[PDB]
Amino acid sequence: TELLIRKLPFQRLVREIAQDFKTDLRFQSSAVMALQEACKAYLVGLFEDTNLCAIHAKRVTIMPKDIQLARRIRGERA
Amino acid sequence: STELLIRKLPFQRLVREIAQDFKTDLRFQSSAVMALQEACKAYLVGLFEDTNLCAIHAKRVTIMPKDIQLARRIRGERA
Amino acid sequence: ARAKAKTRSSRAGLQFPVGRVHRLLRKGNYSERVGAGAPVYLAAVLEYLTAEILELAGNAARDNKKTRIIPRHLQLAIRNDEELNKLLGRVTIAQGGVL
Amino acid sequence: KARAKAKTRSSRAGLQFPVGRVHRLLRKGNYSERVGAGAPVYLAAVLEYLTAEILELAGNAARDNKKTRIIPRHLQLAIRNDEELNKLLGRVTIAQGGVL
Amino acid sequence: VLRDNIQGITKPAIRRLARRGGVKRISGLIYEETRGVLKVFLENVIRDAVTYTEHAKRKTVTAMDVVYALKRQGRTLYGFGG
Amino acid sequence: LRDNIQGITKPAIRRLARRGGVKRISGLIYEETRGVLKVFLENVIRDAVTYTEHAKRKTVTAMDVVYALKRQGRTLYGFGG
Amino acid sequence: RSRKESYSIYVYKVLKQVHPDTGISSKAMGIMNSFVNDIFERIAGEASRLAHYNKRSTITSREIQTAVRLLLPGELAKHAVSEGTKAVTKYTSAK
Amino acid sequence: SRKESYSIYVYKVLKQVHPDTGISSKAMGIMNSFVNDIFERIAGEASRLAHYNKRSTITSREIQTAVRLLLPGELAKHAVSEGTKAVTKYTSAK
DNA sequence: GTGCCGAGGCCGCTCAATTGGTCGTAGACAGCTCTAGCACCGCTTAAACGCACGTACGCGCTGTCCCCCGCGTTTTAACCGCCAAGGGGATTACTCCCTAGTCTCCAGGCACGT
DNA sequence: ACGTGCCTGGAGACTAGGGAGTAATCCCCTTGGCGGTTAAAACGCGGGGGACAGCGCGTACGTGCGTTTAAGCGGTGCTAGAGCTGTCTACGACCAATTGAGCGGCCTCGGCAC
């Protein structure tokens, strides 16, 4: 597990979010594994865009403004 | 509605020159050229908005080819 | 003999055509069958969205001392409302001005 | 009476993918009222060609890593190391593609 | 019920994700921003998955609900079809 | 016809950039913008010509352009009739 | 002796309902037609997908409601669902 | 009940391109997802193409145009060639 | 105060929406099964965490020079109007051949066993 | 990983009908040419704003290490709910007759530009 996101905390976070949409919801294990895989892919792609924004400002340290710029150019809702 | 001139005749010649590499003896409806021009206007204005965002990030006020390249790379457009 | 014909839009209290919406749903290759309430629901939703956009655009035109809605006012209404901008953000309005 | 020996439409077209299953899927899916005779054959040929391309590049990746089997990492490498397949499958997330 | 589990994605996990994306150095203010971004993304996906589940009269979210919710974002996911 | 991308003049690019909020423009921006526009137009016109060829037509119509733009994820209102 | 259909008269009726003294240009009419058409195809396609996911052959108001929830954001979705439910209730109560 | 899948046809194509290579079950699942995704993309594009021209029938001409619209560059040329070859052989084969 | 044109109102017709009846089947509901999601517990050990510390790097400041903007002048080529030609899109009518549907048959693909 | 039974989805043959291919016609809308005349672009110049390199400082990040935390695993049990089968009834498709809604062409004069 190179990109180790731990199972139990992620499952608890997934359950917490779903409580705001429907009460007493169940989850298959494969549904949580799909959510975790999507989260990994999304975050790796966003960190790649963030690193391009940092290099463009002649930096090696990624900063929150880089993430904001990448997400704005992508068109993601702030 | 707040005029933003791209001249009709050179753009038409450009569209005909581009299209002749896909099919010879092609006709164009006039509304097709108007739609293409409107799409080009919108696309370029939005790209310059992203380019200006990229230029400010580098503490500049002058947009440069590298800003366009970064904006298009983040957008996902093919280089 | 039969009773006087009443359009389904009048029955549902709508301005949009329920019968035309049903015909388009049946023609469109969306499903084998179409329920009775589906065209009514769709017409109601379309009427609501049209009313929202025309309200905002009429407000925008009024703020310009103009009594007639033009594509610029529709563009202003779409871009000045967060919900409409999220719904209609990737859309190009002809002659609307790219801001 | 004397029915000839049945011949699959896959064998008539020289294909490995099932023409009959592709025809049934096209009919069932409410894509159109009617389906032509050659449309399932064309679709099955295209699908088989794309499958062959991807499996060839994944086998090359598996061979370059000296493994005798294809794993999802090899499919991810094959997709991302070819320009056309990256253009076709760039927006796609492969399960276990990055990590094994 | 336990809440504030977004802290469950730890700083070293974010560091690992960022190093796989090519990042060399990470500001200390990146972690909270990353947690917020992840929360927004997860909220959108889970909202559409729960809508798909509620439509089907079910009480359990399946892998196909997540796949359908992700697909209609434009984030197709392979390997959960069966 | 050969040199028509130069018909998108430097003042036109300056106007489009000003409308997008740009204050100062480098002199190397115009060739890059012309190349970007050429790529975009090539993609759109290729898909529109495919649509036209499917219909046994010789004239590209506004609906072909609207369909080509729609499948890029760029939706153009006001040319459907 | 031929026709092409549009939503112009209904959009005009709704416009007179909301802004009695305001008019609309033909260009804006075309924009409104394109908008209505686009929203119709979006909702119909989502409803068709929803019916296919559940192995159903009928598109009902439940499919339309779920599609509207999927496609429309936030308060727009909440108000559209309220309007559609109100209209369907009024329709079914009648005769 | 009985889920139909492309595993055996993908395995036949694998033994044609790499007769000594195997494939894991997870890779077969990714290949199944890929085949389904491509089938639904092409069929949807062909269905839209038929409706634009006021037609009721999806023929090989709609499939060819869908392949040319969806596949990029070199991929479209070879896919079109393979489909035309299959249709010609199928038409000749009684 | 005057002139323009485009948007609003009116009428005839014609075709698509409405009403009524019939019937086949899709789906809603009940009952059952048995699978898999959830909760608890104890133990281990991997991973996160908190602190210290050195140094790489972000950021502010300064100075030079280059190259963008604004302005005035000349050029050039878009554009509008008028005319002509002709290609080709849209419509209609006829025909024939291709696809749906039904019934019969069987062989490929999947669960079980080895 | 291979052999085997069976059972369900695919293939064969025939028929009816309507979808689509083809020919003919017309008229409209795209393409080309020519002249003038004017708006827009191209060009040159001068100045100063801004880009960029160099430098110093101090702060915050990466690394290492001992300690703490809680995740993971295996086992057990419970019980909700998903998936399947069977019945039956309401509901939507289909057809035929009726009629009013809606579309196109014409007439008018108002909101804007000059």
Author numbering:
A (entry chain A): 58 to 135
B (entry chain E): 57 to 135
C (entry chain C): 10 to 108
D (entry chain G): 9 to 108
E (entry chain B): 21 to 102
F (entry chain F): 22 to 102
G (entry chain D): 31 to 125
H (entry chain H): 32 to 125
Report text from the authors:
In eukaryotes, genomic DNA is tightly compacted by the nucleosome, in which roughly 150 base pairs (bp) of DNA are wrapped around a histone octamer composed of two each of histones H2A, H2B, H3, and H4 (Luger et al., 1997). In chromatin, genome activities, such as transcription, replication, recombination, and repair, are generally suppressed and epigenetically regulated through chromatin structure. Single amino acid substitutions of histones substantially affect the structure and stability of the nucleosome (Flaus et al., 2004; Kruger et al., 1995; Kurumizaka & Wolffe, 1997; Muthurajan et al., 2004), suggesting that these alterations may disturb proper gene regulation in chromatin (Kruger & Herskowitz, 1991; Peterson et al., 1991; Sternberg et al., 1987). In addition, the canonical H3.1 Glu97 to Lys (H3E97K) mutation has been found in cancer cells, and reportedly reduces the nucleosome stability (Arimura et al., 2018; Bagert et al., 2021).
We then determined the cryo‐EM structure of the H3E97K nucleosome with the Widom 601 DNA. We found that the entry/exit DNA regions of the H3E97K nucleosome are flexibly disordered, as compared with those of the wild‐type nucleosome. The DNA ends of the H3E97K nucleosome were rapidly degraded by MNase, as compared with the wild‐type nucleosome, indicating the enhanced accessibility. In the H3E97K nucleosome, roughly 120 base pairs of DNA were protected from MNase digestion. Accordingly, the backbone geometry of H3 around these residues is distorted in the H3E97K nucleosome. This structural difference changes the location of the H3 αN helix (amino acid residues 44–57), which plays an important role to capture the entry/exit DNA regions at the nucleosomal DNA ends, and may induce the DNA end flexibility in the H3E97K nucleosome. In contrast, the poly‐nucleosome containing the H3E97K nucleosomes was quite defective in stimulating the PRC2 methyltransferase activity.
